[PDB]
Amino acid sequence: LGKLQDVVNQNAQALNTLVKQLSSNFGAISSVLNDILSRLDPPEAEVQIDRLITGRLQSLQTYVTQQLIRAAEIRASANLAATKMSECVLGQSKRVDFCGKG
Amino acid sequence: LGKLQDVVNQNAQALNTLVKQLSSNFGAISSVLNDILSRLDPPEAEVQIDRLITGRLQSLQTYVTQQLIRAAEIRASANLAATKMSECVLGQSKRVDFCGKG
Amino acid sequence: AYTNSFTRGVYYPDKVFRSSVLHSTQDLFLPFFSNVTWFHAIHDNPVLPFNDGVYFASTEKSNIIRGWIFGTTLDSKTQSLLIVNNATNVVI
Amino acid sequence: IGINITRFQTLLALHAAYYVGYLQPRTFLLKYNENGTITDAVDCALDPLSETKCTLKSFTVEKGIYQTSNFRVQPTESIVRFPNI
Amino acid sequence: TNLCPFGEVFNATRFASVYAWNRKRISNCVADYSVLYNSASFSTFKCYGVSPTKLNDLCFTNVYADSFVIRGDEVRQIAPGQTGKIADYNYKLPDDFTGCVIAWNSNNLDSKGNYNYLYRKPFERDIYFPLQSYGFQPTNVGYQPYRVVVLSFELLHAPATVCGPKKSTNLVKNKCVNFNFNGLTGTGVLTESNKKFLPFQQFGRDIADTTDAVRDPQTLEILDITPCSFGGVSVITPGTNTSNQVAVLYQDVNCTEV
Amino acid sequence: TNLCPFGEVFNATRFASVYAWNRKRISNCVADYSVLYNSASFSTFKCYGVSPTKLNDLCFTNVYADSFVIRGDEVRQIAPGQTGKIADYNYKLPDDFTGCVI
Ligand SMILES: *[C@@H]1O[C@H](CO)[C@@H](O[C@@H]2O[C@H](CO)[C@@H](O)[C@H](O)[C@H]2NC(C)=O)[C@H](O)[C@H]1NC(C)=O
Ligand SMILES: *[C@@H]1O[C@H](CO)[C@@H](O)[C@H](O)[C@H]1NC(C)=O
Ligand SMILES: *[C@@H]1O[C@H](CO)[C@@H](O)[C@H](O)[C@H]1NC(C)=O
Ligand SMILES: *[C@@H]1O[C@H](CO)[C@@H](O)[C@H](O)[C@H]1NC(C)=O
Ligand SMILES: *[C@@H]1O[C@H](CO)[C@@H](O)[C@H](O)[C@H]1NC(C)=O
Ligand SMILES: *[C@@H]1O[C@H](CO)[C@@H](O)[C@H](O)[C@H]1NC(C)=O
Ligand SMILES: *[C@@H]1O[C@H](CO)[C@@H](O)[C@H](O)[C@H]1NC(C)=O
Ligand SMILES: *[C@@H]1O[C@H](CO)[C@@H](O)[C@H](O)[C@H]1NC(C)=O
Ligand SMILES: *[C@@H]1O[C@H](CO)[C@@H](O)[C@H](O)[C@H]1NC(C)=O
């Protein structure tokens, strides 16, 4: 099941990465947002929070972009599965080595 | 026409979002670039303009990335279409549920 | 007494022309289908609260509704807005 | 004119009805026509359909399912816990 | 063509005690910000939303002159992101203030002592007691009295009423031109138009938040602002390993511009 | 092995009128900037693209010493990005100026 387990592992790894990026300063004095807001008034805190926004947002764009490209790969796999479903479940396929060796 | 009309809608929505993003101030004092330039001398203006550049460029990179992933979808659909042209127009498709049910 | 406002009290939020467009804004608006405190002049006109500001529909055939007063305490220990609309003019 | 307002009162001549309502901070969608005139509006907070109209920036909403918001259970009260030295 | 009252504001007999600072609205006039900025009088002329140099090119719906005396050590407080009890109870510039702060020594004017100089959210005023005063004497250097004016500038969509000494040209139409309307700087093809502004409206806009139309501030006709003619330049070439001759496609523009 | 002519700069008998400030080129010599930086003679030593510590490790195709007198209130003006009548008419620094003000 290495294929499916890798799709699951990739999604879980990407989510664990996305979550772990909340531990990252990106140059702000903490990565836990309530630290900045409990320590700092808005004129200062806007500077620090812009870095957390920027870093978290850049991480989120990164995650979503990996997911869009992965979604295209899954969609190609879905279209391939749909085609084996059509040609080989709902049919028999003459395409050599399309529906298993033989 | 939901497929083609949604492709038109998607592209127009991507453009309209990219266009709206010109009005988003990205933490600069204003989003009208000529207003910044007619308010401020370069020692000040360059920070404000650089925030707008960083925002607009990031928005543009976003739009182009969305368009590259969408162009890959459209190209996969174009290769699919070209194959239905080659197999079903110029030929007959033996491949179950490739060119219509039945 | 009471009635329903329906879709009323909408105004131009800014002095910018826009056309054939579904623009969106946030402002102090009379909420849609909110409750309307329909006063009468029968045989009185109390001081109201202003809250976040007011809407004031006032159907007429007499032209006797001719002014408004606004402010904090309306009692000379404050400056207080007065409006009059006497025959032709608006006077403030 | 800068003045602070908490109260108001109409003037009538001693010789009628007036239909006071109250404003609120509300998000809205506005239909400007071809003559740059507002012909229609949506109060976004009114109901889940009106939140949908604002989420799509559209006066028609089509047959479907639209995430208008994230619901969050609100903090009931504030709790303070310091060492009792 | 009216001159603005800055000659009053910067010379007014008593600047107020900072607990209850003066505010003069300025409107319906022309302002020489250059003469103010070039004036030998001012110990500081710090500006925030605009450079004091740029001011004459740009104009405003209104300007508010907040006038008061401070101890000369206090000048720190009269900025976005600055703090103190005076700058809490009885003063505050917002942390995104659009304007200028102009201040100078007034020991020659406001010292006597002068115990009238009582001190205590953005532009808030307030009237146990949180109250204090100075007592300014001619013997007081940052412990002396200083006058300050804050000019806070208004950029609403209404027609401008306070402007720099900029001089209007005639209008030009159907031609790609640089323009400035009341401080709206840009470039485009000004043309008179059928977009019917309602009588209160002063700009017109489209999706981008671009000024797609204006109403001229002297003759109240409505102008479209269509873009100056633009498009990619593409060079059609055979191989250099065949010829050095080329042809140029100017994308979408009309040969009439080229 | 020539020691640089900083005595002819910092110990010049008179410095120039700032409308017409003097410029001295320095070339072909050994410069211990620590002899300057460790001198208590200087009320400020601020640097704008280099740290006065680092100077001994780094070296230059030329150095220009610009030398003049000012009123003590003016010292603010003599930096990149500044404003004031001298900074307008007769001592504008580059807004990316690499060097030190003493
Ligand atoms: C307008 O002026 C009134 C006073 O006439 C202010 O009323 C006070 O409001 C605070 C809360 O904001 C209360 O704690 C006080 O008890 C009120 N005092 C009185 C005498 O009513 C009011 O704050 C002002 N409003 C604004 C927006 O400035
Ligand atoms: C709201 O107004 C309606 C009539 O428009 C009335 O029946 C209802 O009791 C009112 N409720 C409140 C809370 O004012
Ligand atoms: C209205 O009232 C003002 C004074 O409040 C007065 O000058 C004016 O003549 C009055 N009449 C009309 C018709 O405006
Ligand atoms: C626009 O306004 C004109 C009068 O200015 C009117 O005749 C026309 O019917 C209006 N059109 C729309 C769509 O409101
Ligand atoms: C103050 O008044 C004098 C004349 O008494 C005038 O020359 C000066 O220009 C005024 N100040 C300003 C800033 O205009
Ligand atoms: C401006 O002046 C011209 C004459 O020079 C006049 O025709 C026009 O009505 C004036 N416009 C305004 C807005 O006062
Ligand atoms: C390029 O030019 C050389 C001579 O300059 C010629 O021999 C060759 O065939 C040419 N090749 C192509 C691809 O045009
Ligand atoms: C080019 O400009 C002329 C007017 O100068 C116009 O008649 C013609 O229709 C234009 N052509 C295009 C392709 O826009
Ligand atoms: C300047 O002269 C003094 C003694 O007059 C000396 O201490 C100092 O080192 C000299 N500086 C330079 C750069 O030669």
From Swiss-Prot, chain D:
Region called Disordered, residue ranges: 72-85
Residue segments, region Putative superantigen: 33-54
Disulfide bonds: 44-54
Glycosylated position list: 4, 35, 76, 78, 84
Superkingdom as given in the UniProt entry: Viruses
Entry function: Attaches the virion to the cell membrane by interacting with host receptor, initiating the infection. The major receptor is host ACE2. When S2/S2' has been cleaved, binding to the receptor triggers direct fusion at the cell membrane. When S2/S2' has not been cleaved, binding to the receptor results in internalization of the virus by endocytosis using host TFRC and GRM2 and leading to fusion of the virion membrane with the host endosomal membrane. Alternatively, may use NRP1/NRP2 and integrin as entry receptors.
Assembly and interaction partners: Binds to host ACE2. RBD also interacts with the N-linked glycan on 'Asn-90' of ACE2. Cleavage of S generates a polybasic C-terminal sequence on S1 that binds to host Neuropilin-1 (NRP1) and Neuropilin-2 (NRP2) receptors. Interacts with host integrin alpha-5/beta-1 (ITGA5:ITGB1) and with ACE2 in complex with integrin alpha-5/beta-1 (ITGA5:ITGB1). May interact via cytoplasmic c-terminus with M protein. May interact (via N-terminus) with host bilirubin and biliverdin, thereby preventing antibody binding to the SARS-CoV-2 spike NTD via an allosteric mechanism.
Full protein name: Spike protein S1
UniProt organism field: Severe acute respiratory syndrome coronavirus 2
Taxonomic lineage: Viruses, Riboviria, Orthornavirae, Pisuviricota, Pisoniviricetes
Gene of this entry: S
Residues of the full protein shown: 231 to 332 of 1273
